[PDB]
Each structure stands twice: as structure tokens, then as C-alpha cells.
Motif scaffolding. Structure first.
Motif, PDB file in Angstrom:
ATOM      1  N   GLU B  23       0.822  -1.203   0.000  1.00  0.00           N
ATOM      2  CA  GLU B  23       0.000   0.000   0.000  1.00  0.00           C
ATOM      3  C   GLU B  23       0.856   1.253   0.000  1.00  0.00           C
ATOM      4  O   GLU B  23       0.536   2.232  -0.677  1.00  0.00           O
ATOM      5  CB  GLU B  23      -0.973   0.001   1.183  1.00  0.00           C
ATOM      6  N   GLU B  58      -4.159   5.807  -0.499  1.00  0.00           N
ATOM      7  CA  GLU B  58      -3.357   4.603  -0.277  1.00  0.00           C
ATOM      8  C   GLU B  58      -2.561   4.700   1.011  1.00  0.00           C
ATOM      9  O   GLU B  58      -2.411   3.695   1.720  1.00  0.00           O
ATOM     10  CB  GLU B  58      -2.414   4.331  -1.454  1.00  0.00           C
ATOM     11  N   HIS B  61      -4.790   3.785   3.732  1.00  0.00           N
ATOM     12  CA  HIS B  61      -4.984   2.341   3.769  1.00  0.00           C
ATOM     13  C   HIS B  61      -3.807   1.647   4.440  1.00  0.00           C
ATOM     14  O   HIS B  61      -3.986   0.669   5.172  1.00  0.00           O
ATOM     15  CB  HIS B  61      -5.136   1.803   2.345  1.00  0.00           C
ATOM     16  N   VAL B 106      -2.558  -5.161  -6.474  1.00  0.00           N
ATOM     17  CA  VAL B 106      -2.861  -5.003  -5.060  1.00  0.00           C
ATOM     18  C   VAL B 106      -4.042  -5.894  -4.679  1.00  0.00           C
ATOM     19  O   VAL B 106      -4.031  -6.553  -3.628  1.00  0.00           O
ATOM     20  CB  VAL B 106      -3.123  -3.523  -4.733  1.00  0.00           C
ATOM     21  N   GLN B 137     -11.305  -2.014  -3.524  1.00  0.00           N
ATOM     22  CA  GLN B 137     -10.486  -2.403  -4.657  1.00  0.00           C
ATOM     23  C   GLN B 137     -11.345  -2.613  -5.896  1.00  0.00           C
ATOM     24  O   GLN B 137     -10.975  -2.186  -6.986  1.00  0.00           O
ATOM     25  CB  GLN B 137      -9.691  -3.668  -4.357  1.00  0.00           C
TER      26      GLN B 137
HETATM   27 FE   LIG Z   1      -4.946   0.333  -1.672  1.00  0.00          FE
END
Ligand SMILES: [Fe+3]
Ligand SMILES: CCCCSC(=S)SC(C)(C)C(=O)NCCN1C(=O)CCC1=O
Ligand SMILES: CCCCSC(=S)SC(C)(C)C(=O)NCCN1C(=O)CCC1=O
Ligand SMILES: CCCCSC(=S)SC(C)(C)C(=O)NCCN1C(=O)CCC1=O
Ligand SMILES: CCCCSC(=S)SC(C)(C)C(=O)NCCN1C(=O)CCC1=O
Ligand SMILES: [Ca+2]
Ligand SMILES: [Ca+2]
Ligand SMILES: [Ca+2]
Ligand SMILES: [Ca+2]
Ligand SMILES: [Ca+2]
Ligand SMILES: [Ca+2]
Ligand SMILES: [Ca+2]
Ligand SMILES: [Ca+2]
Ligand SMILES: [Ca+2]
Ligand SMILES: [Ca+2]
Ligand SMILES: [Ca+2]
Ligand SMILES: [Ca+2]
Ligand SMILES: [Ca+2]
Ligand SMILES: [Ca+2]
Ligand SMILES: [Ca+2]
Ligand SMILES: [Ca+2]
Ligand SMILES: [Ca+2]
Ligand SMILES: [Ca+2]
Ligand SMILES: [Ca+2]
Ligand SMILES: [Ca+2]
Ligand SMILES: [Ca+2]
Ligand SMILES: [Ca+2]
Ligand SMILES: [Ca+2]
Ligand SMILES: [Ca+2]
Ligand SMILES: [Ca+2]
Ligand SMILES: [Ca+2]
Ligand SMILES: [Ca+2]
Ligand SMILES: [Ca+2]
Ligand SMILES: [Ca+2]
Ligand SMILES: [Ca+2]
Ligand SMILES: [Ca+2]
Ligand SMILES: [Ca+2]
Ligand SMILES: [Ca+2]
Ligand SMILES: [Ca+2]
Ligand SMILES: [Ca+2]
Ligand SMILES: [Fe+3]
Ligand SMILES: [Fe+3]
Ligand SMILES: [Fe+3]
Ligand SMILES: [Fe+3]
Ligand SMILES: [Fe+3]
Ligand SMILES: [Fe+3]
Ligand SMILES: [Fe+3]
Ligand code: NA
Ligand code: NA
Ligand code: NA
Ligand code: NA
Lengths: 172, 172, 172, 172
Positions: B23, B58, B61, B106, B137
Motif C-alpha cells: 500500500e 493509499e 490504507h 494489489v 479495490q
Molecule cells: Fe490500496
């Protein structure tokens, strides 16, 4: 016989049941078109929104005919809602052309219903159709024609830039 | 052993450390893309803003995974954040394609993490991944696919007018 | 293959198309029930409103499955929406019993879909079903059971006073 | 001839005078019904209010026909307003049944008036009737039918509890 029924011909009752089905069908066609434009390989969000709105409006029109049937003491008999004639609507222009064709077919049916009501001397039914359906149909057909014209003039469907910009500026 | 640790496999702890790094890597890729669009010879400000926003998301995350590691009594072990695989992202379309590829990578990692959690009978970890990562996602991949489709259909990258108008009307 | 598709089995895609049809069918059953209660010889307006609301909610559920299909890169294939198994729903109690049966059938289908998702190691799909469908179904079944119990305990359907008062005090 | 009169047949003028009388008669019938429910040995206040409201609405309808007669250059000729066919309306159900019968009689007269207007090629008069009278009549007949159904299903008139509860929950 229903305690409310008055001046309501059996043929009119049957024609209203057919019209309920046709409006539900139109709702389903527009639902299909909407989610075609939501595909990742199509991705025209305002086409999708436009057709979803039309879908919901057609459902409302079907429900109003169901209410009418009961108001007059007729009995609702539902039929299968046929799936649409395409799965893949090809382009924004092609979908608008198919919607125009659909709306003219629905209008033709409504005009036949009005003629039947007049032939059976049912002015309540004739006026219901005129007041709630006929000008809505003329407006919808005019709008779809306008959309088809603009997309063609802009260079759709071969110009993907045309459909993109129409999605933003007319349908957005 | 940590006083809080319960039902948390060593393999899961390691996989969370790998996911934190991934991430953070994704955040860095998006940062790179953002400032490419800020170059004077590229100058697409809404591409720049779009990728900067993704960069910051990100990072959030990654921080949530760090919080998870501590919540479960695992220990965070950070690794280098590798620089991205390009310095020059070529075009709006090419960057969107690279972002799509990144997000699918990812997602693959997250799906493997979910499988590991399930295999180790760790329903808290499995649900954490499902609830906070998996639909995010899928949404991100769908959005990037939509963007790629529109840019291609509009004539990018050869049409610089296409990228300009997409920057204004979709990303603006 | 769709550029977004990842970890999405062909069997899952087909099962989602079947579920879309089943939710549209449920919407149609509830529409039929609603307008039965709008008949002049039935005339239970809050039964009518209750089932119309359920109809609209089922349509929303179908649309969310269509969105899911596109999110995952599957392709929507619509099928005919079959007309319901009755035209005349007999009584408030009988309609509630038929709705309970319908909801348990829809739940069974959703549980099979969840099992398929799990068997194909598709945690995004499994979680989508759990999060947006499974507890909604359990709540709907519980509510319908509660309604059936009360109508039976009150003396429906033979007591028309029972259905009248339930319409006013529970559904109003 | 009146300076405003145009396309207004003598037969139409006479039929409008008859319709004015019929609406005034209906107003009087509803007035009678209202005060029957105000008797100390009947004492259903919401039946009384419901019929008083209908009384006032019928008077408004008569006044609108008087306005129409003058708008078209016809001349109003009033006639006696006959007393109703009962002094004692027996029960809530019996009064609702008599109101249903009355409204169907008024509708029949309005349909004959529309036919006359059409036969005399008077589209203004035909549309006036359609727009201001025909759907109002269909709605009133449907509502009265709904009320009759509920009272019968509840056990009226033998169940005095039924009429009491209908007065509270439907008419209140
Ligand atoms: Fe992500
Ligand atoms: C179709 O009519 N092609 C002729 C050129 N033209 C117009 O006249 C309207 C828009 C457009 O492209
Ligand atoms: C890629 O699919 N090229 C075909 C033409 N086309 C579409 O069908 C979508 C947008 C576009 O340009
Ligand atoms: C059905 O269970 N009949 C038994 C009596 N009873 C109850 O126990 C609940 C409501 C009711 O009528
Ligand atoms: C009249 O129809 N009696 C049959 C039983 N019943 C109904 O079906 C409606 C209300 C009611 O009492
Ligand atoms: Ca009839
Ligand atoms: Ca007939
Ligand atoms: Ca029929
Ligand atoms: Ca049909
Ligand atoms: Ca078929
Ligand atoms: Ca076909
Ligand atoms: Ca075909
Ligand atoms: Ca074909
Ligand atoms: Ca008219
Ligand atoms: Ca442990
Ligand atoms: Ca371990
Ligand atoms: Ca570790
Ligand atoms: Ca690492
Ligand atoms: Ca390095
Ligand atoms: Ca390198
Ligand atoms: Ca390199
Ligand atoms: Ca290179
Ligand atoms: Ca796949
Ligand atoms: Ca497969
Ligand atoms: Ca399929
Ligand atoms: Ca199917
Ligand atoms: Ca069938
Ligand atoms: Ca059947
Ligand atoms: Ca059957
Ligand atoms: Ca049967
Ligand atoms: Ca879960
Ligand atoms: Ca009560
Ligand atoms: Ca004249
Ligand atoms: Ca004359
Ligand atoms: Ca006269
Ligand atoms: Ca007279
Ligand atoms: Ca007299
Ligand atoms: Ca008398
Ligand atoms: Ca008498
Ligand atoms: Ca007598
Ligand atoms: Fe329509
Ligand atoms: Fe339409
Ligand atoms: Fe991401
Ligand atoms: Fe459902
Ligand atoms: Fe449901
Ligand atoms: Fe009147
Ligand atoms: Fe009236
Ligand atoms: Na729109
Ligand atoms: Na943006
Ligand atoms: Na309700
Ligand atoms: Na009232």
C-alpha cells in the motif's frame, strides 16, 4: 360485476391490461439500456442515468394504469414481461434510436386505445389517455428525436468523442 | 507473546507487513504519476489532482493496516518503499492503464491475504479485509477501467484534445 | 475478457444473472399483491402500500446486482420476468403467507450463491451477498412471520374485522 | 341571442340546467345523510362530517355548472330541489350504499351530457365535463365502493362495533 363498474367495456378492460404489460416492457428495455452504459467497456454514466430515469418513469406509468383498471372496476391480469430484443445496445446513438422506435410503438398502442375508448363512448377513458399519456409520449418522442439528431450531427457513433461530449453536455 | 494476541498466525502477521509495504508502494506510484501531470510539458492539472488524491488514500490504507497489526498484537516491520517502475508516465491514458494494472496487483495480494486468513481460521482478519479493502479495490478497478475506456474511445493518446477534455469533464 | 475481471468465475457470473431475474420476479409478485389490495372489493389501502414498498425495494435490489455484475466485469443477460402464480391473492393473510414463502425461496437462492462464491474462493462476492442481502432477507422473513402470526391470532381471514384492524394498526 | 354565445346548442343549454339541478339534489341528499349521523340515537360524528363535506363539494360543482352556463351565454333556469328519498338512512353501510347509487346516477347523467356535447360538436363543453366532472365521479364511486366493501367485510350493519370502528379509523 364490480359494484363500481359503469360504462367500461370488456374490450377496454382487456386493452388496459395489454397497455400495462407494454409499459412494464418499456421499463425493462430502458433498464437494460441503462446498465449497458454502466459496463466498464462503455462507461457513459449520464446515458446510464438518463435511461434509468426513463425506466422508473415507465414503471410509474404502468402503476397508474393498474390504478385506472381498479378505479373502473376492471380486473388486472398481468403477463410475463418479455426480455428486450438486445443484450448489447452498441452505442449511445443506437440506443437512442431504439428508444425512439420503442416510444413510437407505445404511442401507436395508446392511440389505438384512445380510438377504442371513443368507439365505445367511454369519455373518461379517452380523457385519461389524453391527459396522462398522449402529450407525455409526444414530448418523449420529440426529445429522443432531438438526441438522435445531435448525436448524428456530432459524428456518432464512429466519433467516440461525440458520444463522450453528448453524455457530458446534454445528458449531464 | 503480546498480551492481546489471540488466534493470529505468524504467517498472517507477516502477510500484513507485506501488505503495508504494498500500500505504501501504491501511494508512491500515485505520487509519481501526480507530479508527472504537473510538469510544464504535460500540464493536466486534474489528472495531477486525481492521482494525488489516490496517493493520499493509499497512505490511509497503509496506516489502517499498521493499526490492525497492533490491534492483533503483531509487530510492524517496515521495508524500503521501492521507487516506481517509470519516471515518465507518457500520457493520461498510459498512466490510467498503469494504475489499473497496479490496482489489480494489489487486489491479487489482498485476495491471497483473505485466503490465508480463511485457511488459518482467522475470521476477524478475513472480515477486516472484506470490509475495508475488497470492495474498495473492486470500485477502484472499475473506475480505472471506465477511465481507460473513455480515453481510448475519445482518441487518446494521439488526440491531445481528448486528454485535455477528459481532464476537464471527467476529472474536473 | 473484460479489463476489470479478476477472480470472478463464469459460474458466479451466471448465478448473478439468475439472481437478478429472481429479484425482478419478486418485485413483480409484490406489485401484483399491492394492486389486489387496491381492488374495490378488497380495499385494504395499507396492505396495498406495504406491498408496493416491497415491490420498489426488490427492484432496487435487482439494480444493485446489475451494478455488481458490471463492477466485476461480468455481462448482464436479462430474461423474461415471469408473471406471478396468482392473479387473486384471496386475503391479507394469504398474501402475507405467499410473501413469506417467496422470501424464503429468494433466501435459499442467495444462500446457494454464497456457497458458490465460497467454493470459488471469491470473498468479494461472498461479502457482497452477506452485507447487502443476507440480513435484509432474515429481517424480511421475520417481519412476514410476525405479520402472519398476528393475522392468524386475530382471526383472519374469516374475520374481516381482523384484516381491517391489522391494516390500520400494523401497516398504517 | 347572447353576444358571447357560439357553438352552444339549445339542447346542451337545457342539459346543463338539468345537471345543475341534479348536483344541487346530490348536495341535499348528502346534507340529509350528514345530519342523520348527528342524531343522538346514531351518533357517528365522522360519518356526519364525511357526508357534510360531500354536500359542500356537490354545491361547489353546481355553482361551477352555473358559471359554465353563463360563460357560454346560456341562461340558468333553476328548478325545485327535491327532498331525498329517505328521512332515516338506517345505518352507515346503508347510507354508503345509497351514496354509491346516487353517484352512479349522477355519472350516468354526466356521460349522457358528454355524448350530447360530442354529438353537437361542442368540444369545449365535452372537455369541461371530462376535465372537471368525469374523473371526480370515477374517484368518488371508487371511494364509496371501497367504503361499502370494508363495512360489509367488517360485519356491518349488524355489528355496531364495525360501524363505530370504521367511523374512527377510516372516516376520522
Ligand atoms: Fe490500496
Ligand atoms: C444530417 O442532417 N447531415 C447534414 C448536416 N447536418 C445538419 O444539417 C444537422 C446536423 C448535421 O450534421
Ligand atoms: C473500442 O472499443 N473501439 C470501438 C469503438 N468504440 C466503442 O465501442 C466504445 C468507444 C469506442 O471508441
Ligand atoms: C395459534 O398459535 N393459536 C393459539 C392461540 N394463539 C397464540 O398462542 C398466539 C396467538 C393466538 O391466537
Ligand atoms: C364478501 O366478499 N365476503 C367474503 C369474505 N370477505 C372478503 O373476501 C372481503 C372482506 C370479507 O369479509
Ligand atoms: Ca360496464
Ligand atoms: Ca362489455
Ligand atoms: Ca381482460
Ligand atoms: Ca399482454
Ligand atoms: Ca420470452
Ligand atoms: Ca432475441
Ligand atoms: Ca437478436
Ligand atoms: Ca441480431
Ligand atoms: Ca380532453
Ligand atoms: Ca495467537
Ligand atoms: Ca502461529
Ligand atoms: Ca512478520
Ligand atoms: Ca515487504
Ligand atoms: Ca530499489
Ligand atoms: Ca526501473
Ligand atoms: Ca524502466
Ligand atoms: Ca523502459
Ligand atoms: Ca476472472
Ligand atoms: Ca471461470
Ligand atoms: Ca451468464
Ligand atoms: Ca434466469
Ligand atoms: Ca410465462
Ligand atoms: Ca399459473
Ligand atoms: Ca394457478
Ligand atoms: Ca389455482
Ligand atoms: Ca463478512
Ligand atoms: Ca381499534
Ligand atoms: Ca350558438
Ligand atoms: Ca341551437
Ligand atoms: Ca334551457
Ligand atoms: Ca331539472
Ligand atoms: Ca317534491
Ligand atoms: Ca318519498
Ligand atoms: Ca319512501
Ligand atoms: Ca320505504
Ligand atoms: Fe410510457
Ligand atoms: Fe413512454
Ligand atoms: Fe487501492
Ligand atoms: Fe430481495
Ligand atoms: Fe427480499
Ligand atoms: Fe357531483
Ligand atoms: Fe359527485
Ligand atoms: Na440525463
Ligand atoms: Na479528479
Ligand atoms: Na406499511
Ligand atoms: Na371523513
Amino acid at each position: 360485476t364490480s359494484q363500481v363498474r359503469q360504462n367500461y367495456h370488456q374490450d377496454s378492460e382487456a386493452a388496459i391490461n395489454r397497455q400495462i404489460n407494454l409499459e412494464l416492457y418499456a421499463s425493462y428495455v430502458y433498464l437494460s439500456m441503462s446498465y449497458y452504459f454502466d459496463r466498464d467497456d462503455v462507461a457513459l454514466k449520464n446515458f446510464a442515468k438518463y435511461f434509468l430515469h426513463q425506466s422508473h418513469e415507465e414503471r410509474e406509468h404502468a402503476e397508474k394504469l393498474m390504478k385506472l383498471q381498479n378505479q373502473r372496476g376492471g380486473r388486472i391480469f398481468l403477463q410475463d414481461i418479455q426480455k428486450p430484443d438486445e443484450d448489447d445496445w452498441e452505442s449511445g446513438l443506437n440506443a437512442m434510436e431504439a428508444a425512439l422506435h420503442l416510444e413510437k410503438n407505445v404511442n401507436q398502442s395508446l392511440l389505438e386505445l384512445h380510438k377504442l375508448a371513443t368507439d365505445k363512448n367511454d369519455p373518461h377513458l379517452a380523457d385519461f389517455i389524453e391527459t396522462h399519456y398522449l402529450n407525455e409520449q409526444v414530448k418523449a418522442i420529440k426529445e429522443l428525436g432531438d438526441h438522435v439528431t445531435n448525436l448524428r450531427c456530432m459524428g456518432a457513433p464512429e466519433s467516440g468523442l461525440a458520444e463522450y461530449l453528448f453524455d457530458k453536455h446534454t445528458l449531464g
